[PDB]
Design a protein around this ligand. Structure first.
Ligand SMILES: *[C@@H]1O[C@H](CO)[C@@H](O)[C@H](O)[C@H]1NC(C)=O
Lengths: 48, 94, 49, 49
């Protein structure tokens, strides 16, 4: 149907067996994001 | 100094008190990797690429680098004032 | 030579052995670029630089 | 910290007659600073820090 995958596509062993992958755009890795907690912590005011 | 990025990072995160620091906290300017040069058209290229790719999915060089490319410092009293910011207090009186 | 330089249309260093058909393989700290990629066939990189 | 390093890349089928030119143009854009313009314009737009 098409010839070029112009999209963000990581390269690994399985895919490289059937299609060559030219050269990398840029180098990245895998990380984890978590929602920040209590933007204003210790909300307990005076008179405590 | 201007040299290879990987070599310079190893020196910088190694000295006494990690005083020596790269500009802008480690900014690179031409992301080109390393490699293994082979003869032109040589047939060993196809399967040697797969072997290197396989190790990346098995976490080999991720822990291997820790055996040779680990730094010593972390790129983060003195009860003295000596004007410091108290000039603003005098600047108010100015 | 060290790491290879092009003088008078000749290559020395590790990249000079492979081009002159004496090595067939060179390893170490080599940086990929267009000029070197024309003579030899670099594999997939495994270290950022 | 990161735990699986692998870059992106343009992909295509085997034996395509463009497996040699298009890789060289990508490398030639790295040195000539083109990827600096594209990365700054899109990714690094900068906000609250
Ligand atoms: C590859 O690039 C060279 C550079 O001039 C060109 O002569 C050649 O035709 C190109 N090959 C293909 C298949 O586009």
């Amino acid at each position: 149907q098409a010839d070029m995958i112009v999209a963000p596509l990581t390269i690994n062993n399985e895919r490289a067996q059937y299609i060559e992958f030219s050269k990398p755009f840029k180098y990245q890795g895998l990380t984890i994001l978590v929602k920040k907690e209590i933007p204003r912590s210790t909300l307990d005011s005076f008179m405590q | 100094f201007i040299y290879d990025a990987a070599v310079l990072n190893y020196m910088a995160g190694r000295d006494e008190g990690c005083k020596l620091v790269t500009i802008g906290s480690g900014k690179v300017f031409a992301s080109t990797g390393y490699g293994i040069a082979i003869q032109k058209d040589s047939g060993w290229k196809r399967q040697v690429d797969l072997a290197i790719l396989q190790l990346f999915g098995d976490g080999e060089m991720e822990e291997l680098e820790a055996l040779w490319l680990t730094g010593i410092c972390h790129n983060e009293m003195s009860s003295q004032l000596d004007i410091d910011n108290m000039a603003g207090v005098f600047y108010m009186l100015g | 030579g060290k790491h290879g330089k092009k003088i008078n249309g000749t290559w020395n260093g590790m990249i000079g052995e492979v081009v002159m058909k004496r090595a067939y393989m060179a390893v170490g700290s080599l940086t990929i670029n267009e000029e070197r990629s024309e003579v030899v066939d670099f594999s997939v990189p495994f270290i950022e630089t | 910290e990161l735990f699986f390093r692998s870059g992106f890349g343009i992909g295509m089928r085997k034996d395509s007659p463009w497996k040699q030119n298009v890789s060289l143009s990508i490398l030639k854009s790295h040195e000539n600073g083109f990827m600096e313009d594209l990365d700054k314009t899109w990714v690094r737009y900068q906000e609250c820090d």
